[PDB]
Symmetry: D2
C-alpha cells in the first residue's frame, strides 16, 4: 500500500538482491517485542504466499502478509547512517518519538 | 488482502481471461453511485500500476488501488445465477441487507 | 475517525437534534444496495452500543459501528442544495465519480 | 473498535480510576522505540480530544487518537502476573512471538 522506500533504502535492498543473485524482493513483517511492544522485520522473499499482498516502490517488490498490513501502512522505510551505525529505519508520520 | 473469490467467480474470471487470450488478472475498484452511495467495479488488468496492491485467491491475480483497499477488504466476490440474471456478487460479512 | 462534517452538515444535524429535543447525535452506517453496491445510512443515536466507536467534529457526536469503520473513514459528510433537491452528500477524496 | 480488555485488565483499570477518584477512562497510544520498533502506551484520560475515537469494553471507556487506530485494532489488553512481575500485556491474534 502507501508503504514507501527512500532512495537509499531501495538502493540498499537492490544491492542485497543483486549480491544475493536471486530473489523476488522484500518482506516487511511485524512481531512482538515484550509485553507492550512491537518489532519491525525485514526479510528476503523468493515466493509470495497466497496470504501475501504485493506492491511496488522504486522498482522494489515489497511483500506483506495481508494480516500485517494494518500495522505497516504509512511506513517509509529509510536507510540511514548515524555515527558508527548504518541501517534501516521505519518511519510513520502518524507515530511519534 | 482478505479479499476472496468463490469457486464460481474464480472459474468465471479465468474463463474471461482464457477467452481474452491475455491478461494479468482482475481489478476490483470502487466508485460513487449518487450522493450517498458506492458502486463496486470489475475490470481486466494487464499491468499493475505502482499505486496498486496485488494478491491471490484461487490462482487469480486480484489488483486493487492501494487507496481503495479500505472499502474492499473482507469482500467475497461470488458469481451467481438468479432467475434470468447471472453475475458477480460482492459480499462482506460486516455489511447487511 | 478522520470522518468530518462540513459547516452546513453540522448545522443541519444540530437543527434536527434541537427540533427533536433529544439525542446523543449522529449514526453513520452502511448497507448493501444490490449485488455490486453500497448505500450510506444516517440515523439518530440515543445510546451508543458497546460495538460502537464514537467521535466528534464541529460539536457533533458521530457514532459508527466498529465493523463499519473501514468503509467510512475519510468521509466528509456535506449538506448541499442542487436544484430542487437538498440533502446530505458523502464525499471521500480516495473515491471517484 | 475491536479493541477489548480482559476481566483482569478492566478490573485493574477500574481500580486505578476509583483510587484516582476521577477520570474519563483509558488512553491506548503508540510510540517509536528505536529504529525498527514500536511501544504501546497507557495513560489516563480526563477529556477526549476532537481527534480521539472513543469506545467501550467491560464498562471501561477506551480513548485512541484516530490516527493510531490502525496500529491498535485487534488488541486485547490483558493484565497478567508472571513471577515477580505484574502488568499489562497487549496481545493481537494477527501478530506473533
Ligand atoms: Hg508482562
Ligand atoms: Hg445530493
Ligand atoms: Hg446478482
Ligand atoms: Hg538506525
Amino acid at each position: 500500500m502507501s508503504i514507501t522506500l527512500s532512495d537509499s533504502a531501495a538502493a540498499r535492498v537492490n544491492t542485497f538482491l543483486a549480491n544475493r543473485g536471486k530473489g523476488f524482493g522484500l518482506r516487511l513483517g511485524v512481531r512482538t517485542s515484550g509485553c507492550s511492544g512491537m518489532a519491525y522485520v525485514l526479510e528476503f522473499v523468493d515466493e509470495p504466499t497466497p496470504e501475501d499482498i504485493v506492491f511496488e516502490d522504486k522498482g522494489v517488490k515489497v511483500v506483506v502478509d495481508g494480516k500485517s498490513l494494518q500495522f505497516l501502512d504509512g511506513t517509509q522505510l529509510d536507510f540511514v547512517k548515524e555515527g558508527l551505525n548504518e541501517g534501516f529505519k521505519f518511519t510513520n508520520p502518524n507515530v511519534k518519538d
